[PDB]
Amino acid sequence: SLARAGKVRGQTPKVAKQEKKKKKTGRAKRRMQYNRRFVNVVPTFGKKKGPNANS
Amino acid sequence: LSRVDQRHRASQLRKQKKEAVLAEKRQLGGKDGPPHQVLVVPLHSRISLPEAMQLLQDGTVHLNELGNTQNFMLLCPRLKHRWFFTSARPGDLHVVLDMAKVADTILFLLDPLEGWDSTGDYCLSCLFAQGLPTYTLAVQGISGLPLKKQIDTRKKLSKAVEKRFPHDKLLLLDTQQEAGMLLRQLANQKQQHLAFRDRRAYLFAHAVDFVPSEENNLVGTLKISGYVRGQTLNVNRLLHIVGYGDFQMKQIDAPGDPFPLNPKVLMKADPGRQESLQAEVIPDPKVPKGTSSYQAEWIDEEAEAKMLEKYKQERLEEMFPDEVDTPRDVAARIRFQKYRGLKSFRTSPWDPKENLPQDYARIFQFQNFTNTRKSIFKEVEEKEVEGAEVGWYVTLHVSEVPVSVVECFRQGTPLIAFSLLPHEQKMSVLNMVVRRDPGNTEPVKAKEELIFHCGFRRFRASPLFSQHTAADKHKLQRFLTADMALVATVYAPITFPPASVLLFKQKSNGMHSLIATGHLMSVDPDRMVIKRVVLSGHPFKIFTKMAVVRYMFFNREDVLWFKPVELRTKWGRRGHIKEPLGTHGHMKCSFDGKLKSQDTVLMNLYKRVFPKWTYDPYVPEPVPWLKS
Amino acid sequence: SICSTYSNLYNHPQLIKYPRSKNESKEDKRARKQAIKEERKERRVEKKANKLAFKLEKRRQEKELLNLKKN
Amino acid sequence: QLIKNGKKITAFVPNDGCLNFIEENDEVLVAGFGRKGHAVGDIPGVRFKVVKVANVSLLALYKGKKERPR
RNA sequence: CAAAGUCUUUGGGUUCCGGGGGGAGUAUGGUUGCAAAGCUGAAACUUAAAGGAAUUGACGGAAGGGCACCACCAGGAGUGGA
């Protein structure tokens, strides 16, 4: 029994992409991922705010 | 179950499949095939196709031409093969789509420094959507550069073409021996059997003569001399030419082949008793003078304005599902007269033989579509009718064409002629599943006047767009949704699936711009479309499971008219209305959950909808296409 | 007159309709025993053949349920 | 139906609304699912996740990066 | 559990035999038997659990007690009738 076909695809409000700048790609991403973790670290009492600590 | 007997079974299966393949290869091109026909499409502007065709031309040539176009016959007994080349310009959408639906191998010529061009891109998306018979790519300027830029140019071509043509090699043309290699290639190639063409019988038009009945009539005997490439064309059947409608013919005859593989007599007549005839529609037509009733009961730029209002309505019907602002002066039960609510849209019944218009008296409804189609295709396949076979160089004397057809052929436009299967000229209700190309971003509303190519036809029409579900009730869409696949529906001649569904729209002065593309679903009027209307509200008094809502009606007895129809709620709640209270639009409503203050109470109303009657057959002549 | 109406079916399109006592002796008991022998034998011939029949019937029905799984 | 032996097969189409991409009688590169012939957790008696529809994949059609010849 | 021990600190000899649960001890074949059946013995497919010990006691349609005229008895007034 073929009920429906594609109901959730085209019926979202089709939000297009915003504008950003590029990532550093290659080695400089590793320089960033090192400095973002182990250089300007904040001393943390329980380490509960993860890398995507989003409320 | 052994080493030998199972290898023997492999031998039997190889014999069966090789016999099938050598059955289907010899009967296409050669001493039985009509010719093998190749159409030629360049894409860019830098291609000088006279230089291409004069490299390509040589064997023995037999040079026809037309008023503008120049097709010709090519014959070589060295390969024992007939080619028939025919050149085309991209952008000439009428000519290319009319003779690549009857072409048999498409040769794309390409510039070396890039892939497609935009006019060629347009024609390429059209030819993708109506079915490629066989593509074979080619380039022309590769010998003019030494090895460095030559190799890198081929790599840039295979990168710029493998985002559209994913796997093919680029057979270059510089020398006439490259033309020999190309012809050896196009002789042996797996023909994609296009399923539409083989289920009918179609002639090309190699030569056209005309004899009028009277010259002031502008009607007369047409004389199409050409080969037959489909089934056995029967003579009692009808005939259609793709540009100028459908019309019944008088005389078939077989003159000799003007151009063999190596160097007035008729076989059949009309008789009109068995010959099916042109019935396009159903051929049957003491109270006081003072006091009230109360105490007596105690007794240029307007087009851009239209465009921007369409973008406004696509915002207001695509941010929102089908929200409708309410009327205010007219009694809101009258303007929504023929609306009734369903409890559930999937389940609750709706009689398909209930409210049929005066134009549903003028259609032919199939009772069982699938078995009638099986019976017709079964008579096509395993039978033999009395008409001429494939390959026969025949002329048709067609009784009833006009003269401008002949003049358009003398311009250089190609004529085709395919017969109809039984019940293919009568009008009924056609259902096309269809999606939208991301080439055009123009809004396409419901009853926009569009142009269809539903299976070798060409006609203006006015559809209604729908959800594509395999249920009973299907929703009306109010705009062409840019990413779903929808179902358009039109009064139109009936055509047996499969068939490709092209749609394009007049931009300005014959600039047919492609919008929609798809295939042909089940054709029957029984598929009724349901148009929905959402009436909005606001819950300005909120109690436990009971709420007073305004701004949905404005009378009082409107609520007495829309009483059994259940409400619903964007937060999911499924209640239905109790008594009204106000003389203005106000009502109390029971519910199941508690009602948020951030709510929008809204009900749904439905009717049956059906397309308009426009089957104007003539299509205006397209112009060369250009970039926006 | 509120949520219902007439709307009858009128005017459609052109539908192209497709026991052992004391005093018995030899051959008197033995006729009764031999009758019980033929009863038991023909009865269990029946029972064996019908068990084989329902084996065939269960097998073909489970083949049909396999077909309905696949098709 | 397959070509290479004549076996008939039920196969699955992965993403949403992608049954609209496929019409009857079209060359489909049927690919299997991952548990070596067992069914998926939700779907009874269905073995095979179809990838390609007429020499393009569903992951391009679902992202619209190509167009479908026929 | 005095062996169901000397077993990751894994080797005294040696036979049969189990690899999720169903489909199934079914097919089909061979074999024995007068026969019923016995012995040997699949696969297609299907399913994410089936199971083994112990562990709490919502539920008792399980049993005992104990209380109450927002329970009964003996009764009163009644309401429910207009």
Place this chain on the structure above:
RNA sequence: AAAUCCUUUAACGAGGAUCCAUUGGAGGGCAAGUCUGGUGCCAGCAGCCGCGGUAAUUCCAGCUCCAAUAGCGUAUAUUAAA
């Protein structure tokens, strides 16, 4: 052989909308969102457990983030885990 590529070198060739880096994922295994909008046991996701019956950590999109990184998925055979 004769070339092309590689190497050596003259001349042009770098401001970030460029000379632009993708493939998968973000409930657990398993690394990383109870962020924002839609859809509402439908469409769908998911290798298994499970999700979705209107406040959806899994759907569909954006943004952020994760693993690898000029490579990464998926199917199948096979080996280790066994």
